Amino acid sequence: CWPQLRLLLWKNLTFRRRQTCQLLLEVAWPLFIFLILISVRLSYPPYEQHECHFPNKAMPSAGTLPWVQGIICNANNPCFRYPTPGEAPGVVGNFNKSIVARLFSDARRLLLYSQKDTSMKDMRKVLRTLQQPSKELAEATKTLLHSLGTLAQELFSMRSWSDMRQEVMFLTSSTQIYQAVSRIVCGHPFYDNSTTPYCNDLMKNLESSPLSRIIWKALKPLLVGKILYTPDTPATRQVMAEVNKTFQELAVFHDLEGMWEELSPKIWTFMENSQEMDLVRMLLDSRDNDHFWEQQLDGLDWTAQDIVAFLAKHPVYTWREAFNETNQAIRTISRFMECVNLNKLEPIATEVWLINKSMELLDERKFWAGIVFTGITPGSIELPHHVKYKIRMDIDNVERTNKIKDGYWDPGPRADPFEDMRYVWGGFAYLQDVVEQAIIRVLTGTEKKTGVYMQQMPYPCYVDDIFLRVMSRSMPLFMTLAWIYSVAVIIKGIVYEKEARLKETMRIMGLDNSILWFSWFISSLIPLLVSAGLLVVILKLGNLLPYSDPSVVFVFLSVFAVVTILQCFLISTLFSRANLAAACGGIIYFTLYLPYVLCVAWRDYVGFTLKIFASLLSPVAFGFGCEYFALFEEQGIGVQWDNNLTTSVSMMLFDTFLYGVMTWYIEAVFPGQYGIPRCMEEEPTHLKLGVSIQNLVKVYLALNFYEGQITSFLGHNGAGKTTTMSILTGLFPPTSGTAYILGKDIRSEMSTIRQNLGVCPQHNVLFDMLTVEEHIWFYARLKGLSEKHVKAEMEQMALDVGLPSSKLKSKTSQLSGGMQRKLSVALAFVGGSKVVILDEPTAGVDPYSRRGIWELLLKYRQGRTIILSTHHMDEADVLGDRIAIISHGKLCCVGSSLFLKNQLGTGYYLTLVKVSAISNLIRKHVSEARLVEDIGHELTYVLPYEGAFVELFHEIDDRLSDLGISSYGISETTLEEIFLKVAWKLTQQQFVALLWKRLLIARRSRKGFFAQIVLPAVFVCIALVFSLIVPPFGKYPSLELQPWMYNEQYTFVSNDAPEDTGTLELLNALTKDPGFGTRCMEGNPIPDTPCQAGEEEWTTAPVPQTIMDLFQNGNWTMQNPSPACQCSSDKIKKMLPVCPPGAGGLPPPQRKQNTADILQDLTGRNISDYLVKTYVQIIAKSLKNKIWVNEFRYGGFSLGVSSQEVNDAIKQMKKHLKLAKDSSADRFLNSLGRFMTGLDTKNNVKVWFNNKGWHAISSFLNVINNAILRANLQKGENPSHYGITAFNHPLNLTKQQLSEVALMTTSVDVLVSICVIFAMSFVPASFVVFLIQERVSKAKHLQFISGVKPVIYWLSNFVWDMCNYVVPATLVIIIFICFQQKSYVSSTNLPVLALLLLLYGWSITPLMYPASFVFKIPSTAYVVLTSVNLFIGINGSVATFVINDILKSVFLIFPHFCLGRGLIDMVKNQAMADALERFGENRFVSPLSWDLVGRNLFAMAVEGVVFFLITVLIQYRFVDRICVGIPPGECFGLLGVNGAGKSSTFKMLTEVHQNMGYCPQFDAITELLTGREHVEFFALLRGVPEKEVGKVGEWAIRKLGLVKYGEKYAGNYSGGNKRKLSTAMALIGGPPVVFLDEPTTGMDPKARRFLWNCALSVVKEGRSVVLTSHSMEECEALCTRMAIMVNGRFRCLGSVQHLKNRFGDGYTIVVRIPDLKPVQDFFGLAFPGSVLKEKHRNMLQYQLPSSLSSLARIFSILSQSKKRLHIEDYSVSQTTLDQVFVNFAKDQ
């Protein structure tokens, strides 16, 4: 058992080693694939990003100055990496150090001090009293001194103007300006025709200044934009007037220039020539006032000396420089604010005019967003209590509304300042908040009393390694390609071993399929394990899968190799061709891998039971395991032994078991064309009996085979000798019979029988890539011989074979057919087998190797029980010692050759070579004589039988010169007799005939290649159906801003400073009956979301034993309230950090708010740390369960706490000091007072928003605005039906975006075009494979032999190919015109596409014609042509992606590229015309224009023409004195030596064409055509009449027989029937000379005689024939004038008898008498040339050379010694023709 496994493994290893061409590619392909993989890996490094927070943005309602400050500097998401103070629950600042805020606060302080100041009036009163020592003078002076000291302190304590002037002077190197502006504004981390060109050049410089050009993108729609709204309802007018007030709040700088121009001369003369200033300067310099100023300064800067130097200066810094600087600053700020359009309000009547005006303003490049209301009628009614409004803005400034989420999840806070922040810099949130605040103010009356801020939630220290994810979630493809190559190789090997019938012989040799499958398994698993180990090595070292144990991945790859090995064992039993299976395995495994990518996209609704029932394949389970590996690898923890993956391994093992069972079943139920689906002479007792059959029978005989005799076994192959020989072997069991083979019953023991019983079937067994010595060694080891015994047997076999040389012993299977057959028949004798069963030896080999094999067989006659079974007569005659014939399953005759020939055989055959005279002489010499047959220069007679022989031969030899007889001959009866006795318009005719034949061969192929019609149909159907799934990619529907667009989310509300001031009522109205927003309130005014009504429970989730450790780890202050968390340590790359328990610290109270979501109170908790830890831990827990984790929370609120005095003070100040009512003084003061009172906020809210949700910030802003509105509502009936809804609907796209979408749709266009190109390329594949089938010596050369004019052949082929491509063209046209694809079904795009497909077919059908020329194998050009067509399609797709002019000019040669570009340009022009019609114009550029489409049509047409021409061109490519005369009726058989070039001479020697007929050596018939139609087509091509064609066909079908099977498929016939059809084809036209070649190959008796009779008859009609073969019996029975060709020249010619007598050997005699030596002694003494050819018991044979002319005396001596030697039987024969042939071949 095990030794056989060892031999099988050795054979497999030798097959692997000797190739030296497959294993190197096998080891290089995975290396190359994964080298490309690692090269791609080393190009994308892992991106690490620290955790950070984002500053809070301020809306316009929270103050104009903080809003502008938030716009200006902190507009980039700086990613602080540390919690900003803005995220603190109490403070909302971060502008502590803002010098502008300090300047404004100092200005407010100066104002409020001046209005409460009395120094001016006190100084005036003191001056009046002094002008009108004293008593009250001292008190007045003291009060004035104190007042002026306080004023000096106040004026010096501002400290803001100093920094402002220093910074503006330093500004008037790249980073210094940025640092200065950042320190100034906040803390520390064609247009020239419209307006004046000054600020045009300013904005040009802003766009060209080398800084972050993002602040300009945010400031452009703010100071240049322009808004417009719905019809002029008075309430809409009121809300727009409120918005206008909010806008003009910042217009204080507009009327400041007039104020300065009006106040400058007054303050100038006040500081120049006023008595008050002179008195102040006088009092500032004294002897006692200096100490007063020193005491009042409190040691501050700007002492009294500096004050006196600055103020008192009539002619180094006085007030004049400050005055000039302030004047210049005012000039600059006025010139800046001049072109700032603060009147951006335009009322519009209708919505269509709204859209038109917005588009016009967009063309004018000055257009901000636009509000659209929903008023019911232009009435004075205030509001319908529920405002629905939309904000229409440009697309490039608003986030798209077609999607609300990125889809696939990926780490990253999504905080890019420009790419995904359009709701901030675009101005959407600003206008939204302004409109909501205006609506709130107009509904109730409260002005602002509310601030709003936006805070982005932080992110917990993530890293970006998307490449690792996409490569570990798509591992199977590149993990499987190399094994696809490996499985193709192993399938090629398996099917090659199975096709050659080697497995059948292995089974016959005494083996079971189990050990073969095991050996194949081991031999294919060893290199797969090697490759798996190497891949584990290259993956671990590649740094692409760190922290992954090599052992577990190695075991995984080993199980994968095992399951793929069993899968290929499954797939191999369905194919019976090596290359076909090797090419189809790859595509079949690709098809089996596709379900994985098909199921991975629909993972949202896939069931575990569906996963199991779909895991019946190997690639899907491997992909699941790889997904497990990826999920456990991405987080850095790796994969280890931790007890999914186990389920995947179990499913893979179940798949292995299922594949094994499927193999075990299919190998038995459906095998190949060779498997089995589930007058008796004296018996010589001188030798031992080896095989004794006894009463053998089957389902609808007894012989005794002996040891030393080579017994023959003849039969009709239908009545026996086929199932009897199989029953003698182990193929089929017996049926009520027994046969003791060498003393062992067949049914008793079959193992010991096969141990000493060789076999040699017709199909030789010789493995390729091996030596004959290794063959003998392997067969001897399989026999069971020892080492020394095997060596001795190999030496003996090499000595007896005849090739004892290293040039042949160490060479591969390269010898000629002769030595190959000799070695194959000698192999059956290795091991010393005592019983051998041959089958058809020397079937089609030359007579020389036949004699050699005969000698080799006779050398093994010393007791081996050779059982011959052949259809040849001479072989079984000269080899068979006991001929036995059976018929009707019963034994008929048995005995020696002489016994069978003299018991029932006819008399002698006497021939004469060159008629009534000789006939009468023979009749007078012998009465029972007759004239058998007379041929050209020959005559035969029969002597049916004895002294008449002597007298007749004497009379013949005496009167020989009388007649024309030149030589005589005598022969015995051959065994074949005993076997038979016992059991012009011709061009149009050829055109229509070819068309008819091809039409029939296409019609009768319904079961055949009919898929070439429905397969392109189903593929184009799949394509056009998939084309109806991709969205139009250019739509933006009306989206409603509501936070519940996401299914589930966690909200939260944090109430800071709970003192009931202004926050408690707001937070209450946020969580009352109306809920969060507009979800459900007296109905559900939101579609597809009715709110869950019943839930009210303020509870805390059950906490595990972590509160314990939280208690024992006390002192958890506000700072560090929870244990820390580590992330991204060195050499440990973690996608998301892992934190210990107690991440948040305490589960907050959870409660549902009846809106399909749950809120948790976060009062007094650190919001940032809690959010970070909860988010990271929840995301980890969610991704742990393989759910494709989505987002968790989106938004929350933090409500906290941060006037008329300044307004009243400004009013009182304006009342005095030269009050007036001009448009320069009152306007500026009122605007400044409004700006001052529009900056204070009592209470505020901070909306925490996640940016992963595209529509989260706006929805939560709407929610908080609705909450504010419902809270500010007073004494209402109920807050239910009071609410606002915000919509987002962009405007229509313009020409630019239309061009962009027409450019980006080309991807889907080429995607749908590629599959059509692939599906349309399957029609010419059938044509080319049919041409290949007809090209290999079948019909092309045969039709070329007759007059066919080969150009007409290709012409008719092209015609039918066009006519047959017409059908699927119209079919697919109808199929995908049924679909409403306006790009194709239009009245202007249908004919162009129609003739585009037509010309594509016309150009593609001749392109694959020359590919059939050099291709000597059928049924495999299909796959390679499909592959190269796919490659051309990929090339055309790449060229379309894109020097382009020459590219599109030279790439028009490929018709696939032509059709692709045609479809692309067609859909492009369709989309362009549709867009132009949408915009309101009309373009009618026809697709048939020469430049666009039509150049491709002409190119494809001329390409088809030139391809047909070059195909015609390729076909045309632009012996020693052979002399013989063939008269009428001369069968001039021209034999030759081995390799004499008979086929070449036949092809050279072949009006003359029409006068010659050919019969191919190989069968030539269409497998799907009919029998009668073959000869009908060949008669049509011969030149017979159209009406007599049926008569000629009937004559041809009746002449050669087979009339019972005349109407059937030629492919379903047999060898004899195929040869009959072939020889009938050569007579359908009736030429004078018919050239035949091997008419009988593998045929049977009672059928060869039929063809021989037909040949003799067609010769007898005066028509000479010419044939050649190897069987010399056929030549001697058919030919009449031989022509032997030794080396190029005719070495011998003449009749058969003349050649047999001239150069032939002597006669041969056989005598029959235990025995006596005296008879042999007398026989040897009688003849001098007697030679003992064979000596047996009671039977002798001898040869007489050079003594044939004395046959009369030979017969006389025989008749004399008949009574003396007591001989029982005599026989005398002449030398056969095969002896003459082997003699001529020996002396060469």
Ligand SMILES: *[C@@H]1O[C@H](CO)[C@@H](O[C@@H]2O[C@H](CO)[C@@H](O[C@@H]3O[C@H](CO[C@@H]4O[C@H](CO)[C@@H](O)[C@H](O)[C@@H]4O)[C@@H](O)[C@H](O[C@@H]4O[C@H](CO)[C@@H](O)[C@H](O)[C@@H]4O)[C@@H]3O)[C@H](O)[C@H]2NC(C)=O)[C@H](O)[C@H]1NC(C)=O
């Ligand atoms: C909620 O919970 C978070 C943490 O989960 C708390 O945030 C912590 O508190 C501060 C932010 O509010 C952070 O303090 C900063 O730490 C920086 C780190 O630099 C080193 O810090 C270590 C101590 O950990 C020192 O030994 C080193 O010498 C380094 O200084 C400081 O650099 C930073 O100092 C600032 O520097 C800037 C620029 O120079 C100055 O302008 C500024 O005035 C200040 O000096 C500052 O001290 C703290 O790191 C942060 N994280 C942790 C783990 O503590 C929140 O505070 C909690 N919420 C509330 C309301 O408390």
Ligand SMILES: *[C@@H]1O[C@H](CO)[C@@H](O[C@@H]2O[C@H](CO)[C@@H](O)[C@H](O)[C@H]2NC(C)=O)[C@H](O)[C@H]1NC(C)=O
């Ligand atoms: C809306 O506000 C703008 C300014 O914010 C007002 O326009 C002012 O008045 C006229 C034009 O109407 C101009 O001469 C002024 O220069 C504009 N600006 C200022 C600062 O006065 C406009 O009148 C307002 N419209 C409504 C309906 O209130």
Ligand SMILES: CC(C)CCC[C@@H](C)[C@H]1CC[C@H]2[C@@H]3CC=C4C[C@@H](O)CC[C@]4(C)[C@H]3CC[C@]12C
């Ligand atoms: C035209 C004048 C009278 C009205 C404007 C007030 C300006 C000019 C006065 C009022 C207060 C003064 C400032 C108060 C003190 C300082 C701090 C010192 O380190 C630089 C000078 C500086 C900054 C003074 C410059 C001049 C000053 C800014």
Ligand SMILES: *[C@@H]1O[C@H](CO)[C@@H](O)[C@H](O)[C@H]1NC(C)=O
């Ligand atoms: C900065 O913050 C502190 C809080 O410690 C506050 O007292 C101060 O007024 C702030 N500065 C401002 C608002 O300019």
Ligand SMILES: *[C@@H]1O[C@H](CO)[C@@H](O)[C@H](O)[C@H]1NC(C)=O
């Ligand atoms: C804008 O697009 C809508 C969508 O159908 C269309 O009805 C409307 O007429 C378009 N308006 C303009 C001005 O193109």
